[PDB]
Amino acid sequence: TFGSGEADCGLRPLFEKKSLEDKTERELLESYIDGR
Amino acid sequence: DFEEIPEEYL
Amino acid sequence: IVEGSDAEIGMSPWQVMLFRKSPQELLCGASLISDRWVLTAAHCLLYPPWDKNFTENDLLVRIGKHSRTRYERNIEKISMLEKIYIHPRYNWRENLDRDIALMKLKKPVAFSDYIHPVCLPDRETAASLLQAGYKGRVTGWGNLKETWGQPSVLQVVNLPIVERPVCKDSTRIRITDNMFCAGYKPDEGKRGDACEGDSGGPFVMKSPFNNRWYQMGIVSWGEGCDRDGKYGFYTHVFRLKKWIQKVIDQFGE
Ligand SMILES: *[C@@H]1O[C@H](CO)[C@@H](O)[C@H](O)[C@H]1NC(C)=O
> Which value, in Å, is the radius of gyration of the alpha carbons in chain C?
17
Q: Are residues C112 and C28 in the same domain?
A: yes
Can you give the length of chain C in residues? 253
Q: Give the experimental resolution in Å.
A: 2.3
* Number of domains observed in the structure of chain C: 2
CATH fold of A1-36: Epsilon-Thrombin; Chain L (4.10.140)
Q: Can you give the residue ranges of every domain in chain A?
A: 1-36
Please indicate the experimental technique that yielded this structure: X-ray
Looking at the CA of residue C53, tell me the nearest atom of ligand 1. Answer: 1
CB C229 within 8 A of CB C186: yes
Q: Are residues C208 and C131 in the same domain?
A: yes
For chain A, give the residues followed by a break (C–N over 2.5 Å).
none
CB atoms C69 and B3 under 8 Å? yes
Identity of the amino acid at C170: S
Q: Are residues C66 and C95 in the same domain?
A: yes
Q: Are residues C74 and C131 in the same domain?
A: no
Helix, strand, coil percentages in chain B from 3-state DSSP, rounded to 5: 30, 0, 70
Q: Which of A11, A16, A35 sits opposite C208 (nearest CB)?
A: A35
Q: Are residues C28 and C97 in the same domain?
A: yes
Q: Which domain holds residue C40?
A: 13-117+239-252
Nearest to C100 by CA among C1, C205, C246: C246
CB C56 within 8 A of CB C85: no
End-to-end CA distance of chain B: 18
- For residue C168, count other CB atoms closer than 10 A to its CB: 13
CATH number of the structural domain spanning residue C38 = 2.40.10.10
Q: Are residues C67 and C160 in the same domain?
A: no
Rounded distance from Cα C124 to ligand 1 centre (Å): 38
Rounded distance from Cα C81 to ligand 1 centre (Å): 17
For chain B, give the residues followed by a break (C–N over 2.5 Å).
none
> Which value, in Å, is the radius of gyration of the alpha carbons in chain A?
12
Q: Are residues C95 and C148 in the same domain?
A: no
